[PDB]
């Protein structure tokens, strides 16, 4: 009756939560940042972007994201942050993104 | 419908039969033959020449 | 295979003296001498003129009966000849004649080709030192065909190699009666065999 | 990874392998990248182990692992000896 692919199942479930956590975190922060960039709040927009960047990259490390995927996430975040800001802006918290 | 080849036979109302294909230029709408020697179709008794058509066992030369 | 059953009865029918018993089919006996007509209740009746088919059937059958070879083996042998280089007729004979059972008869280690079969088959023949018992074995140019050391002095073998002192063995072969060795030198030319067989009609048999 | 290994050819009671390089995940008798040697474990002929050494070395150098049994046979034709 029994195979211990059951194990693999038990395990997939743990990782499934692990990655869910990192992923939903990455979107709440990415959203938050673009939202602040649009309000024009650039110290906190960039503040958050950095956090998001970190968490995306942290995620690239194992199975959760990888690759061009994180890079992409990052790319779109700072493409979207830098521009919303630029409409008003000045990149206050000089942190996060190239001069 | 199906031809029953051989001199004499033992087929009746629920006899099981092997059908063969081959028509008969003579009976219209008889497209098939019965395979003698199989299921309930007996062989042909006393047959001694073309014995393997006609499903007839090789007779004993005692 | 090899038929098994009455022979100098097709020594007849083919109407032409094959040599299936070797030695008797030389006495006032191969029935070609006595009863040169086909077997059976008819046989000595009006010959109806042969269909083009029968002409060739018979020619084909003649040749085959000469070597004592199954039709499946024969057709195969023939189809091989056809694919092979140059004249299918001649080549095909050479392949028939390259057979071990027949080589052994051509060496006169045996009287008849039937006999040769039985000798080969019973371990009495050896090709290049190792023993062969496959009548169908193909003999190649340059092969030593001898009589097995244990068989060397058997009643039949001494009789048969006694008669080979005197005789000439076909040009495509060599023989060493003292030491019981033979050599297949080359493939038989179409003329080296005086065959009572127009092989060109046999090719035509297989064309249908 | 990619492998140097014995692909079985010949026939029943007639093993005749090909020394071949192939993804490990192919079936044994399947498609392969390249043939390099052949091997006849019963030495029914004198040329019963052959290998193209200069190719086997290319393949070893780009990270093909050989089978134990394959290694043995490349060794035997001196793929491994270096003077």
């Amino acid at each position: 009756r029994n195979l211990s692919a059951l194990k693999r199942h038990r395990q997939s479930l743990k990782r499934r939560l692990r990655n869910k956590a990192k992923k939903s975190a990455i979107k709440t922060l990415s959203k938050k940042a673009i939202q602040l960039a649009q309000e024009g709040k650039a110290e906190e927009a960039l503040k958050i972007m950095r956090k998001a960047e970190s968490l995306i990259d942290k995620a690239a490390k194992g199975s959760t994201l990888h690759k061009n995927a994180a890079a992409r996430r990052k790319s779109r975040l700072m493409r979207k942050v830098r521009q919303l800001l630029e409409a008003a802006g000045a990149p206050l918290i000089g942190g996060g993104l190239s001069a | 419908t199906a031809y029953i080849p051989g001199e004499g036979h033992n087929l009746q109302e629920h006899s099981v039969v092997l059908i063969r294909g081959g028509r008969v230029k003579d009976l219209p709408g008889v497209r098939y033959h019965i395979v003698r020697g199989v299921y309930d179709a007996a062989g042909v008794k006393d047959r001694k020449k073309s014995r393997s058509k006609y499903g007839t066992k090789k007779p004993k030369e005692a | 295979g090899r038929y098994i059953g009455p022979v100098c009865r097709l020594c007849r029918r083919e109407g032409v003296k094959l040599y299936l018993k070797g030695e008797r089919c030389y006495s006032p006996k191969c029935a070609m001498e006595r009863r040169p007509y086909p077997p059976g209740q008819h046989g000595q009746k009006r010959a109806r003129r042969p269909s083009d088919y029968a002409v060739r059937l018979r020619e084909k059958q003649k040749l085959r009966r000469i070597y004592g070879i199954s039709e499946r083996q024969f057709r195969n042998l023939f189809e091989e000849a056809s694919k092979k280089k140059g004249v299918t007729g001649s080549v095909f004979l050479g392949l028939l004649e390259s057979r071990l059972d027949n080589v052994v008869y051509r060496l006169g280690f045996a009287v008849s080709r039937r006999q040769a079969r039985q000798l080969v088959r019973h371990g009495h023949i050896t090709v290049n030192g190792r023993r062969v018992d496959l009548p169908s074995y193909r003999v190649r140019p340059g092969d030593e065909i001898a009589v097995a050391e244990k068989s060397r002095n058997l009643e039949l073998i001494r009789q048969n190699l006694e008669a080979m002192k005197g005789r000439k063995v076909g040009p495509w072969l060599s023989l060493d009666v003292e030491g019981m060795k033979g050599k297949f030198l080359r493939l038989p030319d179409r003329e080296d065999l005086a065959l009572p067989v127009n092989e060109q009609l046999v090719i035509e048999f297989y064309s249908r | 990874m990619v492998k140097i290994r014995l692909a079985r050819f010949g026939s029943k009671h007639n093993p005749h392998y090909r020394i071949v390089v192939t993804d490990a995940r192919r079936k044994r008798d399947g498609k392969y990248i390249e043939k390099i040697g052949y091997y006849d474990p019963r030495k029914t002929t004198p040329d019963w182990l052959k290998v193209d050494v200069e190719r086997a070395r290319y393949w070893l150098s780009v990270g093909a692992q050989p089978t134990d049994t394959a290694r043995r046979l490349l060794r035997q034709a001196g793929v491994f000896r270096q003077e």
């Binding site: - | 009746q12 109302e13 629920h14 006899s15 | - | -």
Partner: protein, 622 residues
């Protein structure tokens, strides 16, 4: 051989299935219409061990309807246990199983079961054992309590006695004989010894001298007598209430034969000469399939007895009886609760095989390469009742007949046939109750629902006065003696008669495309003007009955429109010959069985045609 193959056989509801069920429990200390109808119908072999002794048991059905299941165990088994409703004695189907045991030479003990029931009397059984079936019963034990208070069992022979506290077989345990019975005990030891006298002579002498012999040499002397089929040890107990069963099992291992203690069976080599089959486990293989079962979960199960050799699982064998090569794919042992798969099955042993596609009962199996011998098999017997079967709605026609073919293959007392005149499918068995469980087996087991009914008869017609006629050419048509017989135009209107349309027969036509139409219209008319009468098949019947029943039997034959022809004895009973119309002979066997308390039998063979009683005809133009 440390191994006992034994059947349980008895009248209906004598308690065999219960007995068996208790044997498997004691020997255990380390089924559809059977429910609906309350009967055993199929018996299976089953193994268990008593005193380091392999017991193979076939619990047989009681009903005549299933005689085949005895005519089968009584072959392949070596010894029998014959149960009795001791409240009833020897019943008519006890007589039956007995005469079957007789013909296969089956050593046997009896078991007066139900010593607890109101009426239950050992002496009933004993008397009746001797009065009604010619046997010599031998009292091996005695009871402790006329019916309601049957609490314990005296074993004569060993002088010892056992009493049971509960009806559970969990508080048994020896006691001494009490004061009473103790005078009664003795009297058999000696009286067994009286009987043993005829078997040992060391007991013979030792008897005369008033010296009681040794416990072991009696047993051997009894056992010897059992196996020579001259002595029938009687034991008692209540299977229901766990009393005498262990004793019974002990008694199986004491007196019932191991395969060595019976003549080994015979076969017929291809040459033709008879020959005994040595029972060696290292001889060639010879074996008898005696039952096919269609079992999920392993598929077709074939039960076999191995007489010679070692049938080894995962081989090929040869069905000499129908010359097909078969495969034993695995071998099987049926225990009370699970099935042991075994690697082999040696001489003297029964099991079940899987593989095996063609083999049926009576069929003989031998080694793959072995002497193709054919073994004395199993014995027909012949069906007594028959009915038309057709499905309620056709299309089910195929399901129906495919099934009957399956079923006529499982059990060769059930036949299927096709009346040659009117092509209705005629089914035949060993009783009403047989055919009922068959039909009731086509609905449940094979999902085909059928009707049943009297086979319609092959009628005939003829004329009763000579006649001359013109067909537009002229003919004279007289009758002929009953059973005589009989241009191309006239034999052709001989098909349909005027009245019902059955063949016309027993007439002489005298003549005194075109020609055809004239004879056909002439005779067609001659038969009307000739003033006809319907003829109807008449069977010659001989029925066999203990003389008790003769009057009532004959009376009922007369009641069937018969004509008695005479009566001779055949052995212990009495035969009556008679003519009776096929029509009135429907369900005769079960009417007969009521009139003879299941002791009568009968057979029936077409004899002649003859005209009817002027009542039918009108009631037959219909």
């Amino acid at each position: 051989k440390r191994l006992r193959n034994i059947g349980i056989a008895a009248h209906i509801d004598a308690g065999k299935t219960t007995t068996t069920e208790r044997i498997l429990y004691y020997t255990g200390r380390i089924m559809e219409q059977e429910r609906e109808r309350g009967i055993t119908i199929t018996a299976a072999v089953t193994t268990c061990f008593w005193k380091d002794h392999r017991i193979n048991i076939i619990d047989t059905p009681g009903h005549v309807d299933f005689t085949i299941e005895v005519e089968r165990s009584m072959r392949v088994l070596d010894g029998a246990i014959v149960v009795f409703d001791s409240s009833q004695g020897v019943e008519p189907q006890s007589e039956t199983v007995w005469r079957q045991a007789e013909k296969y030479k089956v050593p046997r003990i009896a078991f007066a079961n139900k010593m607890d029931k109101t009426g239950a009397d050992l002496w009933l059984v004993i008397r009746t054992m001797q009065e009604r079936l010619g046997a010599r019963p031998v009292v091996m034990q005695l009871p402790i309590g006329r019916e309601d208070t049957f609490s314990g069992i005296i074993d004569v022979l060993r002088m010892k006695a056992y009493t049971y506290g509960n009806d559970l077989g969990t508080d048994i345990r020896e006691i001494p004989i009490p004061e009473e019975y103790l005078d009664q005990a003795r009297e058999y030891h000696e009286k067994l010894v009286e009987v043993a006298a005829d078997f040992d002579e060391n007991i013979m002498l030792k008897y005369l001298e008033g010296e009681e012999p040794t416990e072991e040499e009696l047993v051997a002397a009894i056992r010897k007598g059992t196996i020579d089929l001259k002595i029938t040890p009687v034991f008692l107990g209540s299977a229901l209430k766990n009393k005498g069963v262990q004793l019974l099992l002990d008694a199986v291992v004491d007196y019932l034969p191991s395969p060595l203690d019976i003549p080994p069976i015979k076969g017929t080599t291809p040459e033709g000469e008879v020959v005994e089959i040595h029972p060696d486990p290292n001889g060639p293989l010879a074996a008898l399939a005696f039952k096919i079962m269609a079992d999920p979960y392993v598929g077709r199960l074939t039960f076999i007895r191995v007489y010679s050799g070692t049938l080894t699982s995962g081989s090929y064998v040869y069905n000499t009886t129908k010359g097909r090569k078969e495969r034993v794919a695995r071998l099987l042992r049926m225990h009370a609760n699970h099935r042991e798969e075994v690697e082999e099955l040696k001489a003297g042993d029964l099991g079940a095989v899987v593989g095996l596609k063609e083999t049926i009962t009576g069929d003989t199996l031998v080694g793959e390469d072995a002497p193709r011998v054919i073994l004395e098999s199993i014995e027909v017997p012949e069906p007594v009742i028959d009915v038309a079967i057709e499905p309620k709605t056709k299309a089910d026609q195929e399901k129906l007949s495919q099934a009957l073919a399956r079923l006529a293959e499982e059990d060769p007392t059930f036949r299927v046939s096709t009346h040659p005149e009117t092509g209705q499918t005629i089914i035949s068995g060993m009783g009403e109750l047989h055919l009922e469980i068959i039909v009731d087996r086509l609905k449940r087991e094979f999902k085909v629902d059928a009707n049943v009914g009297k086979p319609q008869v092959a009628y005939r017609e003829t004329i009763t006065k000579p006649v001359d006629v013109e067909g537009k050419v002229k003919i004279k048509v007289e009758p002929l003696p009953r059973g005589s017989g009989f241009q191309k135009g006239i034999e052709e209107a001989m098909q349909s008669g005027p009245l019902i349309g059955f063949p016309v027969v027993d007439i002489k036509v005298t003549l005194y495309m075109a020609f055809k139409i004239a004879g056909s219209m002439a005779i067609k008319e001659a038969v009307q003007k000739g003033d006809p009468v319907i003829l109807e098949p008449i069977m010659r019947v001989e029925v066999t009955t203990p003389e008790e029943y003769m009057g009532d039997v004959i009376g009922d034959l007369n009641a069937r429109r018969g004509q008695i022809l005479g009566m001779e004895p055949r052995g212990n009973a009495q035969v009556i010959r008679a003519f009776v119309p096929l029509a009135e002979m429907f369900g005769y066997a079960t009417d007969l069985r009521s009139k003879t308390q299941g002791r009568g039998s009968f057979v029936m063979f077409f004899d002649h045609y003859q005209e009817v009683p002027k009542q039918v005809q009108e009631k037959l133009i219909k």
